Design a protein around this ligand. Structure first.
Ligand SMILES: Nc1ncnc2c1ncn2[C@@H]1O[C@H](COP(=O)(O)OP(=O)(O)O)[C@@H](O)[C@H]1O
Ligand SMILES: CCSc1nnc(NC(=O)OC)s1
Ligand SMILES: [Mg+2]
Ligand SMILES: [Mg+2]
Length: 265
């Protein structure tokens, strides 16, 4: 259906391991969108074709205000192109670098939006498994949208593919290559809540080997400025035993979340 000739390409929006993402406009409708470009040679080399097909299949069928749309795809013998909803206010990652830390209202609102999106995903037994600031985008009204579904699967699951970069957002069961389920996303939600308030993730270290140790032992501490409510929520989420982590309804109804969020469930 769609082909490259149908679009005018513009400003580079960002780069990922495989993804090279551009602003683009469809010629006859003037529709503005984002084009995620993948090189076939790199995909074949890394053996991640199944990850691409998952991304397309899972993301194109989901419909939620806090989840980024995928409209379709095409391909041209060196490249694969994913047609995405354009997020005009950028990434949460960039926003965090701008401000250093988020205040409690901003943090609680983001967490509410994430939990709503994840609740929708989990109701289809879809687990994202790669929730981190560079994969959280911002809509025109500043609302958070989950993106990058290349690592997503149906639960329960093992990990069939190599862990690439940072360990910072992954729970013990996944770093230790064990069996895992929906509760992995809830661990990541705790990591994010901490990073939003503090400015860095709670298990950060200088080496892979040391980060690994801090995660498997759940070794984190709080700076003095983190309030009691925030500490309670974060401590509930960062549990070694997955079954002990709260349900998303508990997150959305937590007193600190209700006191500080500006959006509802
Ligand atoms: N729809 C979009 N709108 C605006 N920027 C985007 C969009 N999609 C991706 N980006 C930017 O490109 C980067 C990489 O996109 P992503 O889909 O995460 O690629 P990868 O799968 O390689 O991680 C993102 O971190 C973001 O900065
Ligand atoms: C250049 C094609 S962009 C596109 N295709 N289909 C769409 N559907 C849509 O907006 O549904 C809400 S947007
Ligand atoms: Mg990404
Ligand atoms: Mg990806």
């Amino acid at each position: 259906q769609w082909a490259l000739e149908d679009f005018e390409i513009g400003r580079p929006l960002g780069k990922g391991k495989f993804g090279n993402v551009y602003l683009a406009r469809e010629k006859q409708s003037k529709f503005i969108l984002a084009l995620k470009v993948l090189f076939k040679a790199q995909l074949e080399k890394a053996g991640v074709e199944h990850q691409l097909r998952r991304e397309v299949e899972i993301q194109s069928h989901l419909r939620h205000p806090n989840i980024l749309r995928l409209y379709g795809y095409f391909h041209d013998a060196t490249r694969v192109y994913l047609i995405l909803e354009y997020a005009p206010l950028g990434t949460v990652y960039r926003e965090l670098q701008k401000l250093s830390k988020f205040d409690e209202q901003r943090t609680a609102t983001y967490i509410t939006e994430l939990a709503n999106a994840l609740s929708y995903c989990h109701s289809k037994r879809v687990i994202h498994r790669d929730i981190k600031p560079e994969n959280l985008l911002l809509g025109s009204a500043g609302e958070l949208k989950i993106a990058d579904f290349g690592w997503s699967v149906h639960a329960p699951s093992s990990r069939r593919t190599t862990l690439a970069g940072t360990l910072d957002y992954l729970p013990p069961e996944m770093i230790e290559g064990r069996m895992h389920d929906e509760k992995v996303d809830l661990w990541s939600l705790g990591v994010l809540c901490y990073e939003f308030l503090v400015g860095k993730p709670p298990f950060e270290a200088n080496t892979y080997q040391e980060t690994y140790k801090r995660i498997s032992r759940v070794e984190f501490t709080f700076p003095d400025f983190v309030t009691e409510g925030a500490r309670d929520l974060i401590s509930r989420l960062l549990k070694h035993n997955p079954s002990q982590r709260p349900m998303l309804r508990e997150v959305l109804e937590h007193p600190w979340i209700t006191a500080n969020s500006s959006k509802p469930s």
